[PDB]
Amino acid sequence: PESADLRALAKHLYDSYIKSFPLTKAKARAILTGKTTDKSPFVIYDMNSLMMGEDKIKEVAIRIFQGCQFRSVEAVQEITEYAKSIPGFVNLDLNDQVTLLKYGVHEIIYTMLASLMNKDGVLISEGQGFMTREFLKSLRKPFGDFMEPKFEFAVKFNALELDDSDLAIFIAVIILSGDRPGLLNVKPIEDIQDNLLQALELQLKLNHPESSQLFAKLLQKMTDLRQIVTEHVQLLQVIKKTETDMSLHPLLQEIYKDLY
Ligand SMILES: CC(C)(Oc1ccc(CCOc2ccc(/N=N/c3ccccc3)cc2)cc1)C(=O)O
């Protein structure tokens, strides 16, 4: 409950975040800005560069989508491992652990996705490639509409200039949301989130002392996340109806089953 308890929690989460997520914001920024700690990506900006890129790194929009499913499944695996490290999470009723993961994992995906983006495109294939926003926008409907709202969010989110240590606490706050539909015991979840929110506030005060009220502004961003999810779900429903040769991977299918 004291500051030292809050710092210890911040430290624990950052340590777990680094252990759980092999591609950090620090690495993403090093790739994107040309630092010598990391290597230059191959840039895919049209159909030709895409074909050459697969060699360097079934309509194309569908192949890209199926690749997205696999990255997303990996993301869920990483996020689940991380969630289990949040103090108190694995002590919750198992139904609630499942519910929290079900509603939270994509909110986390879009949050961390911002780390891989700038206004012009997104890192892919563990940072080995970079696919432009213009190219993704050019994919046939409805595949061309998947990424744009995520890019719009990312530009706004990236303006906050958070680092990995900040993000570690923020994503924990997202997971421990007491307002998820169908939760059985809201209070112990809120008890954990209250601790995480305090730890995040202190972390932001110490790590960005010249960023006044960064905490409140960060919380402002969480509104956009649920809207991204809502819009995304509508696009998935279209795909389900128009592309019968495809289904979501079973883990993703479970996540979206009876969501909202
Ligand atoms: C059906 C599916 C897969 O639809 C999606 C379509 C597009 C997107 C956005 C781009 O896909 C990404 C997949 C993984 C990403 N990042 N990886 C991590 C890993 C660990 C932690 C955080 C992020 C980024 C983008 C997403 C989904 C779906 O809804 O699952």
Curated annotation (Swiss-Prot):
Expression by tissue, per the entry, reads: Highest expression in adipose tissue. Lower in skeletal muscle, spleen, heart and liver. Also detectable in placenta, lung and ovary.
Record domain NR LBD: where: 5-258
Q: How is its activity regulated?
A: PDPK1 activates its transcriptional activity independently of its kinase activity.
Post-translational modification note: Phosphorylated in basal conditions and dephosphorylated when treated with the ligand. May be dephosphorylated by PPP5C.
Q: What is its main location?
A: nucleus
Q: Set out the biological process GO terms recorded for this chain's protein.
A: BMP signaling pathway; cell differentiation; cell fate commitment; cell maturation; cellular response to hypoxia; cellular response to insulin stimulus; cellular response to low-density lipoprotein particle stimulus; epithelial cell differentiation
The UniProt induction remark is: (Microbial infection) Expression increases when incubated with M.tuberculosis or its lipoprotein LpqH; induction is TLR2-dependent (at protein level).
Where is the motif named 9aaTAD mapped on this chain? 250-258
List the residue ranges of the region (Interaction with FAM120B).
1-47
| Covalent cross-link Glycyl lysine isopeptide (Lys-Gly) (interchain with G-Cter in ubiquitin), where | 19
Gene Ontology molecular function terms on file = alpha-actinin binding; arachidonate binding; chromatin binding; DNA binding; DNA binding domain binding; DNA-binding transcription activator activity, RNA polymerase II-specific; DNA-binding transcription factor activity; DNA-binding transcription factor activity, RNA polymerase II-specific
- Record keywords, A-Z: Activator, Biological rhythms, Cytoplasm, Diabetes mellitus, Disease variant, DNA-binding, Glycoprotein, Isopeptide bond, Metal-binding, Nucleus, Obesity, Phosphoprotein, Receptor, Transcription, Transcription regulation, Ubl conjugation, Zinc, Zinc-finger
From the Swiss-Prot or TrEMBL record, state where the protein is found.
Nucleus; Cytoplasm
Q: Which residues bind rosiglitazone?
A: 69-72, 106, 232, 256
Name one cellular component (GO) term.
receptor complex
Q: Describe its assembly.
A: Interacts with FOXO1 (acetylated form). Heterodimer with other nuclear receptors, such as RXRA. The heterodimer with the retinoic acid receptor RXRA is called adipocyte-specific transcription factor ARF6. Interacts with NCOA6 coactivator, leading to a strong increase in transcription of target genes. Interacts with coactivator PPARBP, leading to a mild increase in transcription of target genes. Interacts with NOCA7 in a ligand-inducible manner. Interacts with NCOA1 and NCOA2 LXXLL motifs. Interacts with ASXL1, ASXL2, DNTTIP2, FAM120B, MAP2K1/MEK1, NR0B2, PDPK1, PRDM16, PRMT2 and TGFB1I1.
Any domain commentary?
The 9aaTAD motif is a transactivation domain present in a large number of yeast and animal transcription factors.
Query: Related disease?
Result: Defects in PPARG can lead to type 2 insulin-resistant diabetes and hyptertension. PPARG mutations may be associated with colon cancer. Obesity: A condition characterized by an increase of body weight beyond the limitation of skeletal and physical requirements, as the result of excessive accumulation of body fat.
Report the sequence similarity comment from the record: Belongs to the nuclear hormone receptor family. NR1 subfamily.
- Protein's job: Nuclear receptor that binds peroxisome proliferators such as hypolipidemic drugs and fatty acids. Once activated by a ligand, the nuclear receptor binds to DNA specific PPAR response elements (PPRE) and modulates the transcription of its target genes, such as acyl-CoA oxidase. It therefore controls the peroxisomal beta-oxidation pathway of fatty acids. Key regulator of adipocyte differentiation and glucose homeostasis. ARF6 acts as a key regulator of the tissue-specific adipocyte P2 (aP2) enhancer.
Q: What is this protein called?
A: Peroxisome proliferator-activated receptor gamma
Which stretch of the full sequence is covered here? 234 to 505 of 505
